[PDB]
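Q: For a teaching handout, I want to show students what a protein-ligand complex looks like in token form. Below are the inputs, and the small molecule is flavin-adenine dinucleotide. Please produce the holo structure.
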Amino acid sequence: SSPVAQKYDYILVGGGTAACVLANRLSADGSKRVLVLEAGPDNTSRDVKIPAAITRLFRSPLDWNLFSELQEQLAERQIYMARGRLLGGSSATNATLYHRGAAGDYDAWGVEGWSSEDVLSWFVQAETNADFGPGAYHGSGGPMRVENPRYTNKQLHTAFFKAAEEVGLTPNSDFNDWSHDHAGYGTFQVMQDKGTRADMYRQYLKPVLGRRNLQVLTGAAVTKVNIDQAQALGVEFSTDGPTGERLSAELAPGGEVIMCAGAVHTPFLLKHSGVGPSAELKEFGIPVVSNLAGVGQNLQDQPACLTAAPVKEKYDGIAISDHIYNEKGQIRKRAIASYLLGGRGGLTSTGCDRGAFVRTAGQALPDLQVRFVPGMALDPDGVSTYVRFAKFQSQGLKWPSGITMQLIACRPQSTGSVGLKSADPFAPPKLSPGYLTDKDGADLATLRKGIHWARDVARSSALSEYLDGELFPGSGVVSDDQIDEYIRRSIHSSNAITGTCKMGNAGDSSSVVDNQLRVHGVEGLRVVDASVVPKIPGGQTGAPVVMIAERAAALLTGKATIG
Ligand SMILES: Cc1cc2nc3c(=O)[nH]c(=O)nc-3n(C[C@H](O)[C@H](O)[C@H](O)COP(=O)(O)OP(=O)(O)OC[C@H]3O[C@@H](n4cnc5c(N)ncnc54)[C@H](O)[C@@H]3O)c2cc1C
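A: Here is the structure, written as tokens, with flavin-adenine dinucleotide included.
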């Protein structure tokens, strides 16, 4: 009752990160009626705008509340895998960290037309950096806002840098500069506009919500893509939910359907739509339009574990938790006041924006990403501690002061999968992260060796002055087996998730899309989001998504060509 006898030049499934970019650039003439269907609501939550309230988006209405299948290798647990559920997608719920990884990450893709020399200009074109001048690696005129974090914990952040220096790391002054090596300790830039989250809704969709050729439907959950037998022809959605009406939205002659539901829900929606490994599709009774074996497969996420330690009594009150809560658990008015009048203070932080990239075994690129938090975890799952921190508000308790080190396998070797669990298009997908299953034990050894590195750092003079004990894993965890066990029980997602509809050269029987993001054997169906990432780059994945979406956009409208 919303696309009523209206034929669209481009239909966008999902109003996420890449989708926001695409609507902007495709709606930019006047000739292309673009539609955007977003399951979740509009972007208006204050908890999304204030970076520190990331703590309140986890397991919230605005998250998809996805949970993995049982992971036998991880002590038979389910793994919460947070995903944003609103316009802008996970850019509105993410940690705001700005990482491109290294140039080799892209060269390793092997795909023609998408080497590091091909991607670098599309990063720079999307960026306005408050803290680096315009150059080969940084932009000044692009829609994204990037800045150095406007919080500093004067005492713990400096001691982390002194500690890292003590154990032999050297600094890196820009982890996104491909003229020097990726490893090093340093400060991560953040996707923030003076301490407000600068999500892709705010930076791209909001400035164009008035173009008459641009129609944005929130609350609109797509259930399949119409493919008349091969050619996509529309989508089906429901404006209320599982128990509503099954509307349809037709395309114009020449109109394409761009998948933008993310590396979780896109390979899910495609499988419901007829594109996937047939042996899986037959089992639920879905005809096969295209039998591509790579849909669902190659899921790549970056696992994390953590260490935490309290600070000595004499340093009580110098943690970021002390800057956000008072001894009774109410938000400090000084922290509110510095945020609102100046865009400074604890509220601007997601807490994890200083750290390191480390080679644990002389790998070619860093296998380990460290995120240092000047606050103390109280649960060894880091995602839970943030949930816990939110609910800790006004309980009358005092969150103890300490530090945390989150360790991340940033170029992991284990692959996962996204599959069908029900015929119900409103059912949760079958999701298996598959961390720690690479045949060589290499991801587990990255993290185990990360733990030893984090204790060396904590044991340095620089940090031992402040620290007093270790709470996680703790004194009882000495042996490697004991470390490996703790990893298996506390391992959590650093929240990347790429590769489920990966692109590849012609003749790649494993690839789902081609170097122009068109899925094989279907007409007018493209995929532009984190699924197409053939090999996950070293770091958080928001930025490479934006790049991919800019590139795909300028390709569609004939401003650039690939290969
Ligand atoms: C908690 C968290 C922290 C992160 N931190 C960082 C970080 O600090 N820096 C960084 O660079 N990256 C970070 N990431 C990753 C980054 O946010 C994502 O990889 C990136 O935003 C993915 O973009 P996308 O367009 O592929 O997906 P999304 O932005 O998730 O877009 C997919 C969209 O599809 C919608 N959708 C799903 N199913 C349907 C359906 N049936 N019908 C309609 N719409 C549907 C979803 O609601 C969503 O809006 C983080 C991720 C999370 C979850």
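A: Two things your students might notice: The first helix runs from residue 17 to 26. The pocket of flavin-adenine dinucleotide is lined by residues 13-18, 37-40, 82-85, 89-91, 93-97, 99, 221-222, 260-263, 265, 269, 495-496, 529-530, 540-543, 545 (CB under 6 Å).
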